[PDB]
Amino acid sequence: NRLFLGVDLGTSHTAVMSSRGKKFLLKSVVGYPKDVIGLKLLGRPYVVGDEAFEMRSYLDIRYPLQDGVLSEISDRDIEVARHLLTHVVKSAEPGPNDEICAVIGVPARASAANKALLLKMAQEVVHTALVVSEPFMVGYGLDKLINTIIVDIGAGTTDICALKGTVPGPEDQVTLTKAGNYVDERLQNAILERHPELQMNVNVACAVKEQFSFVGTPTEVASFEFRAAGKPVRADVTEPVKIACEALMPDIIESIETLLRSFQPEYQATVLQNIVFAGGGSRIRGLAAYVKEKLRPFGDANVTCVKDPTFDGCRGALRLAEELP
Amino acid sequence: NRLFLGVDLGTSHTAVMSSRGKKFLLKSVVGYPKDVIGLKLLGRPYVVGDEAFEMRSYLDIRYPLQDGVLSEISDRDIEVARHLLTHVVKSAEPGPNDEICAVIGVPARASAANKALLLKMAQEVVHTALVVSEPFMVGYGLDKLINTIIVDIGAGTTDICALKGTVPGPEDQVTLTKAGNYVDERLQNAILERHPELQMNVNVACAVKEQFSFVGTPTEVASFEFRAAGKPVRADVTEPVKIACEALMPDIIESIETLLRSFQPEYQATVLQNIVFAGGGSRIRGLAAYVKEKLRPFGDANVTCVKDPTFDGCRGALRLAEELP
Amino acid sequence: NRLFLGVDLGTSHTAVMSSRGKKFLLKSVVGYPKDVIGLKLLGRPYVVGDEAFEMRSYLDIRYPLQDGVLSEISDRDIEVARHLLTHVVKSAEPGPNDEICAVIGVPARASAANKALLLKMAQEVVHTALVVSEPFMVGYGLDKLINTIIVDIGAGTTDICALKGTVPGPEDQVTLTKAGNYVDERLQNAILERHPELQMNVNVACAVKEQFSFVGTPTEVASFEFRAAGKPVRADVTEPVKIACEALMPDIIESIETLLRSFQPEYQATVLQNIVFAGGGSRIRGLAAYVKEKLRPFGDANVTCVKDPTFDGCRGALRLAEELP
Amino acid sequence: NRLFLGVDLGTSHTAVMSSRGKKFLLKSVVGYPKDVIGLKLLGRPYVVGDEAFEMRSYLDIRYPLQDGVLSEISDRDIEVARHLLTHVVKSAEPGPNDEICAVIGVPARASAANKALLLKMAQEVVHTALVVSEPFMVGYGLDKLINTIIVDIGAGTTDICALKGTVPGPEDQVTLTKAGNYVDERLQNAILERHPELQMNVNVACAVKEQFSFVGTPTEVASFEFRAAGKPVRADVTEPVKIACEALMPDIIESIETLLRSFQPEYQATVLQNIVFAGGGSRIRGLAAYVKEKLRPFGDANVTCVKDPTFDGCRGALRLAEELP
Amino acid sequence: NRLFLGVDLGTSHTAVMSSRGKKFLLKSVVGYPKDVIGLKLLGRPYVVGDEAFEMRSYLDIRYPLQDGVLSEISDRDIEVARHLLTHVVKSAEPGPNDEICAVIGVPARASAANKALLLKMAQEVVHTALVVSEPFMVGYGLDKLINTIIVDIGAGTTDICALKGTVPGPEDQVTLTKAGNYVDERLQNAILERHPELQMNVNVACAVKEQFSFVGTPTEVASFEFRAAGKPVRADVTEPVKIACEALMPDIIESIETLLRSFQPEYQATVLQNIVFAGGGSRIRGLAAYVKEKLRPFGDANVTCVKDPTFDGCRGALRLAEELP
Amino acid sequence: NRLFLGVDLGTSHTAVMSSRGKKFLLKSVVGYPKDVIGLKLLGRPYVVGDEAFEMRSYLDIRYPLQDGVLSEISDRDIEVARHLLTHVVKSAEPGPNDEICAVIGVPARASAANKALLLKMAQEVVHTALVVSEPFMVGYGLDKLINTIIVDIGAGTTDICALKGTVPGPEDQVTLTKAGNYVDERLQNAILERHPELQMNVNVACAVKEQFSFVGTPTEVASFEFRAAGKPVRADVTEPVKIACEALMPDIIESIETLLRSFQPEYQATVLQNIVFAGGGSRIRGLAAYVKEKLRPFGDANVTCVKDPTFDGCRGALRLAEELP
Numbered sequence A, B, C, D, E, F: 001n002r003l004f005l006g007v008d009l010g011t012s013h014t015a016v017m018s019s020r021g022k023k024f025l026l027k028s029v030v031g032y033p034k035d036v037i038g039l040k041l042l043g044r045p046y047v048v049g050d051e052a053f054e055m056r057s058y059l060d061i062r063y064p065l066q067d068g069v070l071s072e073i074s075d076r077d078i079e080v081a082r083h084l085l086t087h088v089v090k091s092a093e094p095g096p097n098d099e100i101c102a103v104i105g106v107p108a109r110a111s112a113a114n115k116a117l118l119l120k121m122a123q124e125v126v127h128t129a130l131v132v133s134e135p136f137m138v139g140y141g142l143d144k145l146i147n148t149i150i151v152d153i154g155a156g157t158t159d160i161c162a163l164k165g166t167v168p169g170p171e172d173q174v175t176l177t178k179a180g181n182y183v184d185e186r187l188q189n190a191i192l193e194r195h196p197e198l199q200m201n202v203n204v205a206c207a208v209k210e211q212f213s214f215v216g217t218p219t220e221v222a223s224f225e226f227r228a229a230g231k232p233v234r235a236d237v238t239e240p241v242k243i244a245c246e247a248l249m250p251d252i253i254e255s256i257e258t259l260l261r262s263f264q265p266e267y268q269a270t271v272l273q274n275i276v277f278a279g280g281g282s283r284i285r286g287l288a289a290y291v292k293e294k295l296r297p298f299g300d301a302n303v304t305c306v307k308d309p310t311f312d313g314c315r316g317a318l319r320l321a322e323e324l325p
């Protein structure tokens, strides 16, 4: 028997669909206990996913992918990734006589090396595996494979991928490193710039951003409970957050504009009425409309942010390997 | 039972009439999907005609005839043509006990080799097939088979054909390569000369030309929405277009003059009052009158551009094989 | 066979648990008889523990640890500590074929020198021995190894130890010298300040404190029978005692505040709802609530004083070496 | 003083002879540098001839003649041609008091328009200029001006020209577009058909063809070093090349047959014993003999391929204007 | 009067040449004193360049460019960059009546945003400024502007730039983030993997790498004096270092291979005999030869590492704006 | 007008410098007469400084700081400290229109409470006052603010302070309680251990120590005139004294080692060549060299004991507030 997988193996969240109807999401992160006590507390030699990030306190949490690309700045990060992947496959619940055929998404324009490392690292766990551009397999998740831009803004990477009809490209892709994560790093700097007394780690501003990110007009008051020398402080982050999230957008815009001019002229109009935002960063409030406005120089853009950014990635992959060799 | 066909198998549009009252037109073009995704998008292994040119984005559209002559610069282009032809016959709707007798038009003075390739390639689909000059079978479509010039200006080829009474000639024919398509290539160069920022492919200027082509006096403002680095730009193409379409005409004129002087002197006066333009290029605005003027040195020309350039080709063929063995 | 020990080797009270179910407590103190008559009275060449402190009159009682750290301000104090330790092991009742594995607590941030001197001095008596922070092994005694402060207020030392998850720290520890004992010294001075006729030694005020210590609101009348020029005098020590015990607290508070601001901001809220007081000084009346109030500037603290301050120290140690190499 | 020129102004090579004993050949091509860097690299504002084609990399090389006819699909191509022509005259080395009388060859049956454009464009550089059929001025180059066919196969055009005695014709000429260049386009398609991994541009297959072209029997192994995804690959092109170059020949043959039947019957036997191949395409291996065989239905052809295809064109022109007004 | 500048504004080292014969190099880094004492120690409100990195101890050293791109993850980093740039211009020594025309290099395929931020930020200091690809302005520094690859491996970025003749590209560029810095991060992880007791910061391994980096065969013993718990330790880093620096190379190779296949086939051979390494990372021992070997599948590469990696960057820029508007 | 003060407010000796050139030293101690006769003898209601310690016989001498920290184990000790401080300011000789700006040193890592109590208690006497780490203000007294350890060994406290560049730390400080005084206590015990007939108070051994303290090799005979049952006895204290003063050192060493491993590895070598001993305990004979030897495991230490331990403390403070707001 055969089981196929959609694995959008994201730098922060790995989503997974299976032919047999698992949707599940998890954090792409593996906790190791830090010492012999951690090991005790944790009750197992490592954790993966959201439990790891709950116990983030007393585990060394290791993201196995940053810049989406599967990491090798340590010989350890290979073992991490093994765990992660082992765990996502295992949490697909399959066997004993189940032949796992998988689709993995990566960042578009992730090197052959890194596609090979995944591919290898999957071909350790699943027998047959397939590595495609996230943004494309998004697009393929919506039948938008034609005269379309996607802009997966994610965490690690904003990928932007003209679906210049069907061939999923490698000059029709683009990736920026300015993505979610960089917004937080920034945001944090934007808050620490103005309430210099604050403690923020990035995991804080991460959450400020998730909760109040927007662009353009501030539609409300962005008030958040930070700490300062340990003391609770409520503070206004409207302006940090504005700044932060409208620091993604320049690059995305310019890099749509760039893809747009790659399409045949007869179709550019039509492309613009197909610009998509998928992935986390596509949940920014007012994004849509901020883009529209940024693109008026190219025409009437109709920008849409997908329905459920959480799975469109895998949804696609899945459908994709519902359908071939 | 017997069914006969008029197939004006043109380089850009293949028109077809049948004895049983199909008129239909289609683009002479066959799309293949480019990759395994295309194949999916397209829903079939190839398309032919105007759907192919809609999906031009993500299909490799292959015209199977350029210079009208049926192409062999690939072993593939034979299969293309098969598809085209298969499809035009099939869209004539005939069977199961229907013996297809066909007339195909070609460019006048298309080589015996090429007439044989069609003929062969039709005798694969229809049982009995007949390949004549387009311009003649136009002329035969209007009872102008005597002391007449036609000038089929088409896409690929302008053919020009003295209907030196009845024998349809091979020194009374002429073909130029400068035809529609060459107007576009040119036009495009004429626009890209002056708004060097523009993108044009030829399929754009094609459309500029269809929409604003004229000769002589510019009767209006030729304003068109081009792209520049992706940005919409409205621009004035009156002068490009003038230039472009009055780059057909020299050769046509000289080649009428040339046919004219082939006729017996007693009749040349009379010929001139019979010059015809058939085919697409005959839709140029002001053509008629521009020719008249070009021909004053030979006399009072009365130049006419046929009633419905779309079918006169096949109309003829049809009538033609309504009437013999 | 193997026997493991929890030895909370405190500066005033050494508690001990064994795997085989001894709990016992004793005073960390060894009496030597003062002279040849003492030796006679005492019936043995030294005592250890509460009998020593009964006979405190006519023995030279030598605490072998002050500031918890095991003392070397005499070459004698090494022999003392031997006796003490010899006696606590021996009162664990083990042999003849018993291999003693021990955990000893010290003050958190006791020097490597002093951990070595214990360690040595235990590795004289037990074969394998382990020296950890008291406060941690408390915390480990309550599964509170995460986002927790403990404050062991003891006699010698108040130790305060963030259980910044599991690694038991050395910037996440703190020790103050102001602890029990310093309260008494003080208290005494606070009583001798106002009833200057009184005799107090510290061993008196030690007992006033044990009996009436509180902080904040005086919940009752602190009347105690002191002497003056030998003459019994009952006197009111409510205000001495208030003063005395609320002279611990500043430092503790400031040093919790300090540890609190060491945790990641995302968790400080959570820490505060985990502040513990263990050890003797944690028996102060109203401590809990006085702390809560001192910490309102950091949030809603939920401060708890452990269930049985007497053993939580060793309890832990025990459990701790119930569980590894 | 007077200086006369043979200029065979070919679509790929322009040869030139002068009365004063220049033979030189050059590529009919003018490089312009592409940008402000090119301009720097090139050291001059344009190049012409073989240096242009060396620097083909970083120049926009523009052939100023395709289909031999002097191009006007750009207003630029007029300036190109100026450069070319300016340069071929200038490289004839003449002045200051030298009156240049020139013979240019064109494709036989190049329109009056195009003969006028050259003629004009020469009468800009030389004072008196003469435009004749290449094939004829070849024939005139060999005293074969009688009962002769030539077949200039060139690059752009195969011209074929009955030398129906002396009047050089315009129903005794013929030109096909299928010539050299079309062999390459084809060849390339024939190689890319079978080693679909290969890169070929036409400039490659051009070179495969020059190096291995033949017809009929493959006299050797046609092995050539192509690239595939950049990787060197040696591959066998014997069958591509067969296919390609025997795709010229049908049209040539049919068009000789056609000229042949134009001659008076008494002479056709004799004509056949005079069929010539001039020009590049006449260098195909085995051509001679392949034709012979193709023409057995007409008799014993004696087909010859001229001695030095490089100059016979101009050689003629030259001689030609060594001899009149 | 006019003064022009070559500013290779690198992420670690900014080199600068002026028309008037300054070469100088500095570290691209600005030290701010950390507190009111730092300010005192430092004697000025900020430092820039190598003094900043000497005083790295007690300054907050802020690189104003990482990933070469000029940073905006802080509103501060703009002021940094101002200082840096102010300082590099000022250390060009020019005025009072000197009009500074500059060339700045960036990473090839740095966004328009970032070219604008520099450009702006230069047009604050110099009046006219120009921002080009480092690798190109290298290539232009060696007349290698044709059928050439460069691979600037630097610190931040390895840029790899086909000099596909002269137009300096934006599909003919490539940048990787795996560059010097990433080697150190890695290396450090590679050493800390094996001598887990070691302290390394990256600034250590940075120096291990500078001193012992190689690839392929270890030509010697890589012994280095690290610290462990403060204690000097000499250790062997041959294998870490191997690992580390041969973790650049995959991406570079693949991305040459990729550029190579972008060139016209006729030239790829020739390209390969032009592959350059410029910039710091080009100082790796045995690089050359390791590449050669990696590229044997594409042919005989002749890889060269430039003469003086320190200035080729600016050298170029300089020459470049020695020569135009 | 403004007058600034260096007050190194030490637990045994308070040194003071003023801007106007007072150096003076005094004992940090206030004598009160014990009774109505003392009051008569003393001639004033209290003394402060060395007269108090002369009359130590018949005054109750109260150090107002032990452990350096300003004492509160009595409500009296606040009045003491007032007197002391009143007297050190007053002996700075300033008024009537003099605004006293002061720097007071404390033990590094003295609690905020205690810094506040001084601060308060100075802001009673001087208008503006500043409380910093002694060891830092030493270091600042020698420009050694960088990659330096100091070890102030004093009386109360040995402070040890990495001058981890400029920010004066609170994890880069350390204080031990084992300092001078603890040496004496010990020494005394070391002499009473061996000449059990002796009387020593600590004030005796204090003086033995001052006079004969050394470490390592005994460079001479330590003979001193003690009493026994009142009877003068000369006795050899070489071995007591060895023992005593080499009981400081372990902790200091371990706590340098500890700070050393806190510095960045690149600098630890360099730190070691900057280890300082300031303060009284730094007068121990052979200290320097004994440390060197203790630290060989970290490298070649170059340990220096400051020039004039008496004032380096205040010297600094002074300079310090010669230089700011």
Ligand SMILES: Nc1ncnc2c1ncn2[C@@H]1O[C@H](COP(=O)(O)OP(=O)(O)O)[C@@H](O)[C@H]1O
Residues within 6 Å of the ligand: A009, A010, A011, A012, A013, A068, A153, A154, A155, A156, A157, A179, A180, A181, A206, A209, A210, A211, A213, A279, A280, A281, A283, A284, A285, A309
């Ligand atoms: N509601 C939100 N608003 C803004 N950013 C968000 C939101 N939810 C998630 N993100 C950001 O988008 C990223 C998560 O999107 P995701 O599709 O998982 O990224 P990836 O799949 O590349 O890991 C993170 O950087 C996160 O902070």
Ligand SMILES: Nc1ncnc2c1ncn2[C@@H]1O[C@H](COP(=O)(O)OP(=O)(O)O)[C@@H](O)[C@H]1O
Residues within 6 Å of the ligand: E009, E010, E011, E012, E013, E068, E153, E154, E155, E156, E157, E179, E180, E181, E206, E209, E210, E211, E213, E279, E280, E281, E283, E284, E285, E309
């Ligand atoms: N001798 C060397 N061996 C290996 N890498 C080196 C060497 N010298 C410098 N580097 C590395 O190359 C980089 C410096 O090169 P550079 O041209 O200045 O980079 P950039 O200009 O992008 O700042 C750093 O990452 C450094 O560690």
Ligand SMILES: Nc1ncnc2c1ncn2[C@@H]1O[C@H](COP(=O)(O)OP(=O)(O)O)[C@@H](O)[C@H]1O
Residues within 6 Å of the ligand: F009, F010, F011, F012, F013, F068, F153, F154, F155, F156, F157, F179, F180, F181, F206, F209, F210, F211, F213, F279, F280, F281, F283, F284, F285, F309
């Ligand atoms: N010559 C000496 N040798 C050893 N210790 C000394 C000497 N002089 C003073 N001391 C000790 O050092 C301390 C005095 O140093 P000091 O800087 O005044 O300490 P503090 O300033 O902390 O009161 C006293 O403990 C004293 O016994």
Ligand SMILES: [Mg+2]
Residues within 6 Å of the ligand: A010, A011, A134, A152, A153, A154, A155, A279, A280, A313
């Ligand atoms: Mg994603």
Ligand SMILES: [Mg+2]
Residues within 6 Å of the ligand: B010, B011, B134, B152, B153, B154, B155, B279, B280, B313
């Ligand atoms: Mg037609």
Ligand SMILES: [Mg+2]
Residues within 6 Å of the ligand: C008, C010, C011, C134, C152, C153, C154, C155, C279, C280, C313
């Ligand atoms: Mg205790």
Ligand SMILES: [Mg+2]
Residues within 6 Å of the ligand: D010, D011, D134, D152, D153, D154, D155, D279, D280, D313
């Ligand atoms: Mg020719």
Ligand SMILES: [Mg+2]
Residues within 6 Å of the ligand: E010, E011, E134, E152, E153, E154, E155, E279, E280, E313
């Ligand atoms: Mg560089």
Ligand SMILES: [Mg+2]
Residues within 6 Å of the ligand: F010, F011, F134, F152, F153, F154, F155, F279, F280, F313
């Ligand atoms: Mg001191």
